[PDB]
């Protein structure tokens, strides 16, 4: 039937057809993470009593800890929660390095500027987010905390580089006047305060912004989600999750001379060849389960419906009438101590035919 479907026919001619594959399945999953003893110090980032003006935005490094992102995501307190390069749902199971939380206070109409490729006074002069960015921009209204102070850069010689924090406040020439200092006419002080008041409209209400910048799947992980490890099962097809890396295959001990600073190995296709286990620093190889490849030897259907099946690159130890040949394992055919003219070719000197009780 598989042959009939690939050929779009209810009648099959004599010969060999190539169909399906041999796809051995994983039977269980495996999860392995480094054993991290700390919970991440984020109270300081999100629930802080003071935020920087954007102009002099703060940057906090997060490391050697567990972070449950379910809580921030599910919380309804945020006005915005926009992730780039990652789904908030998936974020919880990923492991990272060099995680940073940038933070500052902005006016509500500036929310649109904290984005990878937007322009404006913040995006260009106070806080530039890279066009190439992985991470989440999370923010909420702080009118009840900040309104009664904060200064923003309006006059700058050039646009900022991503993640640049330039805080010189020197008064300088804008126009034709050859001066610095001497504010007035065409020389100006670079910043303006935008005090926040309870009477400000929403575009002028303060917002507390936290930007979480991540380096995903750097070989090490220091910041890792709340996921439990399982036992490591060897010599079976499994799913995998080595410090955030996934795939399917059979894992075995590997006699490889990894250097002390190495923890992954790669193939010519730049796919994972090997990993160093996160808890026991053993080198393990990952080999895909099986490909097979199957062709079906068919007498024409106007004669009979018996078929023989050839598994192209297998041993007759894996998968009555089983013949091992150079071309694969031929199952259902009866090998004989004879020779004849070739009819349906198989390969490597072997052919097959339908003959007599046929």
């Amino acid at each position: 039937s598989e042959t009939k479907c690939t050929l779009k026919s209810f009648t099959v001619e004599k010969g060999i057809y190539q169909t399906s594959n041999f796809r051995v399945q994983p039977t269980e999953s495996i999860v392995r993470f480094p054993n991290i003893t700390n919970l991440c110090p984020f109270g300081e980032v999100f629930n802080a009593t003071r935020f920087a003006s954007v102009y002099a935005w703060n940057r906090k490094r997060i490391s050697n800890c567990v972070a449950d992102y379910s809580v921030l995501y599910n919380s309804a307190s945020f006005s915005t929660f926009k992730c780039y390069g990652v789904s908030p749902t998936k974020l919880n199971d990923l492991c990272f390095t060099n995680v940073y939380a940038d933070s500052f206070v902005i006016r509500g109409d500036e929310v649109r500027q904290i984005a990878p490729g937007q322009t404006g006074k913040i995006a260009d002069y106070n806080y530039k987010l890279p066009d190439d960015f992985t991470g989440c921009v999370i923010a909420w209204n702080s009118n009840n905390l900040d309104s009664k102070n904060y200064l923003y850069r309006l006059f700058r010689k050039s646009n900022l580089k991503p993640f640049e924090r330039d805080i010189s406040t020197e008064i300088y020439q804008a126009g034709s006047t050859p001066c610095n200092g001497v504010e007035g006419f065409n020389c100006y002080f670079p910043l303006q305060s935008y005090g926040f008041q309870p009477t400000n409209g929403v575009g002028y209400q303060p917002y507390r912004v936290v930007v979480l910048s991540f380096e995903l799947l750097h070989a090490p992980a220091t910041v890792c989600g709340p996921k439990k490890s399982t036992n490591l099962v060897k010599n079976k097809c499994v799913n995998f999750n080595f410090n955030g890396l996934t795939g399917t295959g059979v894992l075995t001990e590997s006699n490889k001379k990894f250097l002390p600073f190495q923890q992954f190995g790669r193939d010519i296709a730049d796919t994972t060849d090997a990993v160093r286990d996160p808890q026991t620093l053993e080198i393990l190889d990952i080999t895909p389960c099986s490909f097979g490849g199957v062709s079906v030897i068919t007498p024409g259907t106007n004669t009979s419906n018996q078929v023989a099946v050839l598994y192209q690159d297998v041993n007759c130890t894996e998968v009555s009438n089983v013949f091992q040949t150079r071309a694969g394992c031929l199952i259902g055919a009866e090998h004989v101590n004879n020779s004849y003219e070739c009819d349906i070719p198989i390969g490597a000197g072997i052919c097959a035919s339908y003959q007599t009780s046929q």
Partner: antibody
Amino acid sequence: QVQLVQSGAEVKKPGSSVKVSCKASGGTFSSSAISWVRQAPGQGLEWMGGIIPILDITNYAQKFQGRVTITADKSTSTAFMELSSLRSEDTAVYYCALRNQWDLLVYWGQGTLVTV
Amino acid sequence: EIVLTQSPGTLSLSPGERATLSCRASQSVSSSYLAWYQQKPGQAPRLLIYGASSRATGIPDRFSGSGSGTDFTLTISRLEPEDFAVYYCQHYGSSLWTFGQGTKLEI
């Protein structure tokens, strides 16, 4: 949102143990840390020890290093503290307190008096 | 460890007066992990100030404070009779907690 609910008061005989139960209402049993604090009558507060239910890690005050075992039940969102080899010296109010990651507030239970 | 010491150990003040309680650390601490509590006999400690600032939800708003390094203060702008209480500072180091000294306030 967060509420800590503790078990009632108990009277012990010398040498026995007391197991104080603290239920975490409001959720976030995991991804938070729970500590136990004691207040002997006429005294201020002192730390006994604590646990991180998600990481399965315990930590104790040197004063209480040994005697007390702290555990956590994820399924029932409940933390426990069992203090053995009790003496009249241990008459105190035993408090449960916790903090969520991502937060700054420390939430408290009611305090349970245990006499010996 | 880091030991917190408060001062004065005891004090008698009148309602209507401004009052302050100090808290000194033997080692510098992050302001973000310091907190002040109020206690009345028979009651669980009540949080007033956290992160060495940040007035707690439901607070009377007569209380405020600040500090850094090794030196922190709790200020009551005007004492009301209800503010005469045991007060203490604590450090939530998360791996280490520090408690002690109630600077007991009486009329």
